[PDB]
Every structure is written in C-alpha cells, then in structure tokens.
C-alpha cells in the first residue's frame, strides 16, 4: 500500500511532465516530435543515475527507489507516443524519418543512461 503511493505519486508527476512537455513542444518538428524525445532521454538520464546511486546506497528505503524508477521515470517516458509517431510516419511514406526516429530514440536513450551511470560512477571515484 505504501508502495502503491510511491508508484502513484511518482508516476503522476512523470505523466504530468510528459504531458506538459509533449504538448508545448511536439508540434514544432513533426518528423521527430521533440517532447516525446526529451522525456525519454531525461528519463533515461534519471534512470542511469538512479542505477549508479542506488548501488552505493544499498540501505535506501524501497519507497524512494520505487518513486524515482517505477514512478517518475516510468511515467515520464513513453513507448506509446513513440510508436504512433513512427507509425504515423510509416503510414505517411516517410520511411527515412521513421527509421531515424527509431535510431535516435534507442541509441539516444541508451547514451543518456550510460551518461547518468558513469557520471555517478566517476563522481564517486
């Protein structure tokens, strides 16, 4: 029950952020909507740092780990929007940006996780 509040409090902030970020920005470059991208990189950044930090503090309350990863990162990022955008571009005959959207999101959100992880790995050393 206390864990369901971590997911709901953490996931509400993330869903709200992804919403405010996705409407205020997505329409500016329809070939690769940038609101659905920043939340995914920013959530990839946060999960990467969450990865390295939670390792060095094994005694953290699972409430705060749940709020940041399953809640915040989970709500903030989104596969659905990334699909319809790519599905929209495939149905529009825009194969080059469908492939680029896929390539950028995946290569990018991994690079943003490796960045968050090693920045904390390196700061602790």
């Amino acid at each position: 029950i206390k864990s369901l509040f971590a997911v709901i409090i953490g996931g509400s902030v993330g869903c709200t952020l992804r919403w405010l970020l996705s409407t205020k920005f997505n329409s500016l470059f329809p070939n690769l909507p940038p609101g659905t991208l920043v939340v995914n990189l920013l959530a990839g950044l946060i999960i990467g740092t969450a990865l390295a930090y939670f390792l060095r503090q094994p005694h953290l309350d699972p409430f705060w780990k749940l709020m940041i990863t399953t809640g915040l990162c989970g709500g903030l990022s989104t596969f659905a929007a990334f699909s319809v955008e790519v599905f929209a571009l495939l149905q529009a005959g825009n194969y080059i940006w469908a492939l680029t959207s896929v390539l950028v999101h995946v290569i990018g959100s991994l690079i943003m996780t490796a960045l968050g992880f090693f920045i904390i790995t390196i700061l602790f050393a």
Partner: protein, 96 residues
C-alpha cells in the same frame, strides 16, 4: 495551434478537360491528402480521391469543357493531442 490545413491551393496547369492543382503542405505529419472536386452548380455528384502525404500535387481528369468546378483539399494528419484527424479544407473555384 499549428494549422493542419494546406495553403496556396491553385491550378498550375489546365486543359479544357483536366486540371493540375498544387498546394503547400501544412506544418504537421500528413498521412494523406483528400482532393475533392465537382460542378459548382450544386447539380452534380462530388468525387474524392486520396493522394500520398508525400505528394503536394494532383491531376483531376475527365472534366467537362467550360464548366465551373469547386476544388478542395484537406489533410488526414497526426498531431499529438488528436492523433489521427481530418483538417478543415482549403477551396478554390476554377472554370475549365
């Protein structure tokens, strides 16, 4: 707030029995365009055909010489809020 409607719809080439229409795409992911045409004198049926979202021109053929036609073009587009939807039309009158 980004307009989903095309702009500058115009007949760029004409014979008595065909029109080459063109337009300028909107600032949105456009999946396909619908071109609609028919006799302006509301005494004739309307026809519609899709063109891919990559094309910004279309040929209307089989027309009657010396007749006034209404030509309209609207989009089926992906936005973030509305997902798939149909935009309002841009319309021109043109006599062959």
């Amino acid at each position: 707030s980004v307009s989903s409607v095309p702009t500058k719809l115009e007949v760029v080439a004409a014979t008595p029995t065909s029109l080459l229409i063109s337009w300028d795409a909107p600032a949105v992911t456009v999946v396909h365009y619908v071109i609609t045409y028919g006799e302006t004198g509301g005494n004739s049926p309307v026809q519609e055909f899709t063109v891919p979202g990559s094309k910004s021109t279309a040929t209307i053929s089989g027309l009657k010489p010396g007749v006034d036609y209404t030509i309209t073009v609207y989009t089926m587009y992906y936005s973030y809020s509305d997902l798939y939807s149909y935009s309002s039309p841009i319309s021109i009158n043109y006599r062959t």
